[PDB]
Design a protein around this ligand. Structure first.
Ligand code: HEM
Ligand code: HEM
Ligand SMILES: C[As](C)(=O)[O-]
Ligand SMILES: C[As](C)(=O)[O-]
Lengths: 185, 185
């Protein structure tokens, strides 16, 4: 977003952010409209462009902020828990913060309704949403792959909560024990 | 594709398939054109529609056939190798059949240039490209996740071959030993 967005008071900036978040919880990016957001906020359309270059700007900003949060939900556990137990705890933070949440829809669109055009503009502008050390390491890449995939399938196959828990457990156990041990047992 | 495509002689059907494959090795789906394929084959445009409903039909068919092959490259090893060693061998089949191949471009577009519109039409029409038992199991889901992710990054970050091998090894070892053992060692 633009400097004027960041120079808003906490209360005003948080209101603007909430309206942008709410638009993206209820519409895919292709369906989202600047007009919806300004009518929610009851501000002239012009005001929107003082905060953001365009819709994409707001979308990327919302994505970056919510993803940072959903990631921190996991990465914060590693300060006070084994990776094993952090993963088991994260399962339930996901129930509360992803499945039973308005973010369910935000993430379904991100996962299913992405495009090369979005990726093209997203990737070069993006700041890390994971810890600085935690991008370059094999542990994060493996857990990313497997957990993102469970989330993708949750959306894709419209899993119930119990089906999500069942597969997460099976697959995170396989990751934890390894392929060799899972095979022996 | 339509019945008339399948009723072609092996030689004629294989020629048509090669031209469709070649169009998709050199263009993203959005950039691909029926006109390119028929000019390659030197047949009237009308002939194309006797073989396929539309471009999407040919694209999906090509994708399904090449993916079946790239998957079988792995799954065929499991008849004659430990899963551990099959994975290590697969790394090199990927060098020969993905990186140094015309399929590099076919797969880059599939990985990076997909859309909800494509997925919407793809998913319900798709037949399995993996063994019947091998869709419903946690091993396949974990290996899918991790290997697809290595492939995504290969394309995304334009990895050299050596960088692909380095990360594959690190990450497939972590999968094989497990997170616990990788941490201990
Ligand atoms: C243990 C849990 C997770 C880990 C370790 C993890 C890890 C990562 C990593 C490392 C990246 C950056 C990829 C790179 O730059 O190489 C990433 C990106 C991202 N993650 Fe996660 N993730 C986890 C769970 C989730 C969940 C539950 C969601 C959403 C429901 C999510 C959504 C995203 C999104 C939207 C991105 C942006 C780029 C992309 O799609 O890859 N992640 N994640
Ligand atoms: C050990 C290696 C691999 C395994 C076990 C694997 C497994 C799978 C599985 C199980 C599916 C179907 C997902 C489902 O229906 O739940 C799938 C789909 C697919 N795979 Fe792979 N895969 C591997 C490697 C590759 C590679 C190297 C490529 C291409 C370069 C690839 C490309 C695809 C494509 C294009 C699909 C179509 C749907 C999708 O994108 O998920 N796979 N794979
Ligand atoms: C500090 As904010 C997530 O309201 O822009
Ligand atoms: C049998 As075929 C892959 O040429 O349609």
């Amino acid at each position: 977003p633009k400097s004027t967005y960041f120079s808003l008071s906490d209360e005003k900036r948080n209101r603007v952010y909430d309206a942008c978040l709410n638009e993206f919880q209820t519409h895919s990016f292709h369906e989202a409209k600047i007009m919806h957001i300004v009518k929610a906020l009851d501000i002239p359309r012009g005001s929107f462009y003082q905060y953001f270059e365009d819709l994409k700007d707001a979308y990327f900003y919302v994505l970056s902020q919510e993803t940072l949060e959903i990631h921190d939900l996991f990465f914060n556990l590693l300060k006070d828990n084994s990776i094993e137990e952090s993963l088991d705890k994260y399962k339930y933070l996901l129930l509360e913060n992803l499945i039973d949440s308005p973010q369910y829809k935000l993430y379904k669109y991100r996962f299913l309704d992405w495009t090369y055009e979005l990726e093209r503009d997203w990737k070069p502008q993006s700041s890390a949403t994971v810890p600085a050390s935690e991008n370059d390491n094999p542990i994060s890449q493996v857990l990313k792959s497997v957990v993102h995939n469970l989330v993708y399938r949750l959306f894709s196959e419209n899993w119930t909560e119990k089906t999500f828990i069942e597969n997460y457990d099976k697959e995170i156990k396989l990751v934890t024990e390894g392929l060799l041990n899972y095979i022996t047992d």
